[PDB]
Every structure is written in C-alpha cells, then in structure tokens.
Amino acid sequence: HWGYGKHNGPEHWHKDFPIAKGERQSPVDIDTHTAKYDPSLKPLSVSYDQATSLRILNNGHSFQVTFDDSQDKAVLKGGPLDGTYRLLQFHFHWGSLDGQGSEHTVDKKKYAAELHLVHWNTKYGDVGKAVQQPDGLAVLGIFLKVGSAKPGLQKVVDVLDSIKTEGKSADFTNFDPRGLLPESLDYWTYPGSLTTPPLAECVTWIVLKQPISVSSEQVLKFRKLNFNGEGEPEELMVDNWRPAQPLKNRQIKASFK
Ligand SMILES: CC(=O)O[C@@H]1[C@H](O)[C@@H](O)[C@@H](CO)O[C@@H]1S(=O)(=O)N1CCC(OS(N)(=O)=O)CC1
Ligand SMILES: [Zn+2]
C-alpha cells in the first residue's frame, strides 16, 4: 500500500523495501560541474521506427503506455549500454505546481515533470528476470518544462479522461514515442535503481540534457488524473515523484562537454 502521501510516501518505503537505503538508489541530483565528460561513451542509439504501442493504463501511481516487447521493435542501444534493450513502457512523474515534479534534478533544479522510457536487456529474456540483474534495465529520462506545447504528446493527454481512476485502461495503438524526444541526445548516465517499489538496483540511467517543452494545458490534464479508484474519495494524482537520493559511491558521466 505504498504511495506518495504523508503516511505511505517515499520516507516510508524502506520499511517494506529496505533496499530504499541501498548503495545505488535513484533518482539523484545531477551536479553538472561534477559530472565527468567520458569521451569513450558512444552515441545513444534510439530505434523506435517499428514501435507497437498497445494500451494506456492508470496504474494508481502514474499512467503508462505499454508496448509490444515480444520482438526487437523499439530498442535502445549504444551509449553506456552493452547489448539490446527493448522498450516495454513509458510513464511520467509530475507535480502539483510547475516548479516540482521531476525525480532527477539538475544542480538542484526541479522540472515540472519527467518522462521515463523503460527498456529491458534482451539477454535476460523477460523483464521480471531483468529486474534481478545489475544491468537488467535502461531507463531513458527526459525532463519536461512548461512553455510551448509538445504536439507529439497531445494524443496522450487527450485520452487521459478515459483512464481517470486507478485500474482503468484503454486501447492506445499506433502511438509514436519519437514525438516525445528532444532534438539533442546528449545525456548523463549513472548506475541506479527503480524509483518506485521494489526499488530494485537494476537500472542504467540515461538522462537527457535537453528538456522538452509542454504547455500548461497539457500538464493540467496530467493533474486531473486520480490516485484513487472510482467511488473512493478523490485524491488528485499529483506529486508522484521520489526525491533525490544520496549519490554515495557513484560518478555521473556526461556524453558531452
Ligand atoms: C508497470 C510498473 O509500474 O512497474 C512494474 C513493476 O513496478 C516493477 O517491479 C517491474 C515488474 O514488472 O517493472 C514494471 S515496469 O517495468 O513497467 N516498471 C515501470 C515503472 C518503473 O519505472 S521507474 N520510475 O524506475 O523508472 C520501472 C519498472
Ligand atoms: Zn518513473
């Protein structure tokens, strides 16, 4: 019954998931002046042209768009990664106000939201097995700021009324996640974890330097979603972000100077 409230939020999670206080937890603050440029980092390879979106779902802690990951259709490769990572789903974290909502921060700056494109390493065969491995997942993180609208996001926001409450899902085919990407693929990378329970330490994080801009109307539609199931007291789905965790014995690497 974990969540993001006063009595079940991130400060409580360690009781059910003691790895919450582990050695490679996420998110973290990205100190841009301390991140080390690593000229050996290869360019990110994002191959999304054959992506097959399936469903969109309110899972009670966010909403997610799920993809067919039974074939190499939408994959992430290169960068700090060895091998091929299949896109399983994407989801967002966002705030009650534009000055908060992101999980990662940049020089302590919070963005209005953060997009996570979740991929798993095909050498482990399925995502359940991948989450048990130190290099099982690669999550591509993209910051959202409020300004101009993001046209590629609009098809997502327009269906959110149909999945307002926990458990609701809808058909969401032929969605192209390339429409969510910024111009630059410049990134920071570090070894980390899931940012929701079970907080497994299985993620190579790849966080893009360039945020995308979304409109105030687009983020307002995020904030109209509900944590609760239908018929329960309405609690707006906002501030579903875990705060920055201690960096401990890790170095964030940058793909750029
Ligand atoms: C669907 C979902 O919300 O997460 C589940 C689950 O919590 C986790 O134990 C594992 C089991 O299937 O992974 C999936 S997930 O792959 O789709 N999932 C989504 C949210 C988590 O993303 S996060 N915020 O680290 O980036 C990563 C794992
Ligand atoms: Zn996430």
Catalytic pick among 1, 7, 61, 119? 61
Question: Encoding tokens for residue 56?
Answer: 């969109």
Binding residues for substrate: 195-196
| Cα angle for residues 152, 180, 210 (degrees, 5° grid) | 130
- Distance in angstroms (rounded) separating the CA atoms of residues 165 and 225: 7
The data reach a resolution, in angstroms, of 1.5
- Distance in angstroms (rounded) separating the CA atoms of residues 235 and 40: 47
221 CA to centre of ligand 1 in angstroms: 23
**Which residues, including other chains, have CB under 8 Å from residue 156's CB and lie 6 or more apart?**
56, 65, 175
Atom of ligand 1 nearest to the CA of 200: 9
**Which residues, including other chains, have CB under 8 Å from residue 186's CB and lie 6 or more apart?**
208, 209, 210, 254, 255, 256
With CA atoms as reference, report the closest residue to 209 among 156, 253, 149, 242. Answer: 253
Bridge pairing between strands 63-67 and 85-94: antiparallel
30 CA to centre of ligand 1 in angstroms: 22
Sign of CA dihedral 123, 127, 131, 132: negative
Look up the domain containing 201 and give its range: 1-257
With CA atoms as reference, report the closest residue to 245 among 27, 4, 2. Answer: 27
Residues in the ligand 1 pocket, defined by CB under 6 Å:
59, 64, 88-89, 116, 118, 127, 131, 139, 194-196, 198
3-state DSSP of the chain: CCCCCCCCCCCCHHHCCHHHHCCCCCCCEECCCCCEECCCCCCEEEECCCCCEEEEEECCCCEEEEECCCCCCCEEEECCCCCCEEEEEEEEEECCCCCCCCCCEECCECCCEEEEEEEEEHHHCCHHHHCCCCCCEEEEEEEEEECCCCHHHHHHHCCHHHHCCCCCEEECCCCCHHHHCCCCCCEEEEEECCCCCCCCCCEEEEEECCCEEECHHHHHHHCCCECCCCCCCCCECCCCCCCCCCCCCCCCEECCC
231 torsion bin: left (phi>0), alpha (psi -120 to 50), beta (else): left
**Which residues, including other chains, have CB under 8 Å from residue 88's CB and lie 6 or more apart?**
66, 67, 69, 118, 119, 120, 127
CATH of residue 248's domain is 3.10.200.10
Q: What are phi and psi of 173, to 5 degrees?
A: -90, 165
180 torsion bin: left (phi>0), alpha (psi -120 to 50), beta (else): alpha
Bridge pairing between strands 137-146 and 212-214: parallel
The method of structure determination was: X-ray
Bridge pairing between strands 253-254 and 36-37: parallel
- Residue 61 is a catalytic residue: yes
Domains held by the chain: number: 1
- Distance in angstroms (rounded) separating the CA atoms of residues 161 and 130: 33
